[PDB]
């Protein structure tokens, strides 16, 4: 059984980072060297592991989280980062074991006229814990005027639209991201490299 990373990496649509998707990969064999060279990745940074060495290990579970952020925020997808994305949208733990993988998706996720359906959370009462999620679209009432679910004065929508256009500079173009994390438990599933 070959691990279905094609479904992850090549999904037509990607989650908003505030609603980042997670797929559990299990009971399969994957070649991570092949994966490393399967496409042109603008970043491919591993912590505690590396493709060539993954090819010789077995794990209980592999999780593939995926979403879209802008180019200059890929660097927030790392252990011990801060900023809007790391604080409020997608948080890796300090002791992360896995790989962060990104590539420019300007051709797929921009619109001439702007794509506002990719969003990120701009504020939150407190920072995300690692791998915590916050999908609330609820308007935040900052005064006594009820919002009844409508933006306006004292009524802040907590999600900001990226608004991706092809004309944007590289750092503001959309990037698709896949975070592979690797888990070993006393459990029966196994996800192995070709020589594990």
């Amino acid at each position, epitope marked *: 059984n070959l691990c279905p990373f094609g479904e992850v990496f090549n999904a037509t649509r990607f989650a908003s980072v505030y609603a980042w998707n997670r797929k559990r990969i299990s009971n399969c064999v994957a070649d991570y060297s092949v994966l490393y060279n399967s496409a042109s990745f603008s970043t491919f940074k591993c912590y505690g592991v590396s493709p060539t060495k993954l090819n010789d290990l077995c794990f209980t579970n592999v999780y593939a989280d995926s979403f879209v952020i802008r180019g200059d925020e890929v660097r927030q997808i790392a252990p011990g980062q801060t900023g809007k994305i790391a604080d409020y949208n997608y948080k890796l733990p300090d002791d992360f074991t896995g790989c962060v993988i990104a590539w420019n998706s300007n051709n797929l996720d921009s619109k001439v006229g702007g794509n506002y*359906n990719y*969003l990120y959370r701009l504020f939150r009462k407190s920072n995300l814990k690692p791998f915590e999620r916050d999908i609330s*679209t609820e*308007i935040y009432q900052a005064g006594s005027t009820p919002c009844n679910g*409508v*933006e306006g004065f004292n009524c802040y929508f907590p999600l900001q639209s990226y608004g991706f256009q092809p004309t944007n500079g590289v750092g503001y173009q959309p990037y698709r991201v896949v975070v592979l994390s690797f888990e070993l438990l006393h459990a029966p599933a196994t996800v192995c490299g070709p020589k594990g």
Partner: antibody
Amino acid sequence: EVQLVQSGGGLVQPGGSLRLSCAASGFTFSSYAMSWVRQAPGKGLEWVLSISGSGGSTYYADSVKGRFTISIDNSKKTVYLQMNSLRAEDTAVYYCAKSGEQQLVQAEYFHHWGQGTLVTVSS
Amino acid sequence: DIQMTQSPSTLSASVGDRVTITCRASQSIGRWLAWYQQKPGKAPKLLIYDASSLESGVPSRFSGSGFGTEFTLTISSLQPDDFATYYCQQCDSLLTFGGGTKLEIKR
């Protein structure tokens, strides 16, 4: 199940006003951009207006810009289309339509449709 | 604006046939494209979106393909219910439709 139930419509004098309703059930009302699409007798489909799930972004087509208004009542899970200064070229069946997942702000595609409402503009 | 031009404007086929209707965009719209089916006097129904994604509960004989300017809808083995008008639609720059292709019974 997702339902879009349309109300209002009918015959209106040229230059008049009319408001259409679209009553939503069976999904989270604020999780989806909502739109209106119309079809003039014997023609194809024309998108006219949209509003984001939060109500904070509205998008108009130029043939209705300045005359038509789209609005949200969350407690009633209802979309309103307020039509002013109606002309005869506005005679059409008007469809309410719900967008798909990951379409919170802009309508991309029209995954669910209301049953349609005849607006007839004639003297 | 971005204009959508569908081709052919009318197509005649029989049950069991495989049909192919085309939709061309004045400029590149990437994957921002959907196909719909409409019977006379009834609400359209979404069939394909993002050029190639099948909507839920649409029969798998329907497929879509294309990226950029040239898009195709394919019905593999036609059936009675399929005789209808079909519209493509782009959402790359506002939301415009193509003129439509009518699919009629060959006799």
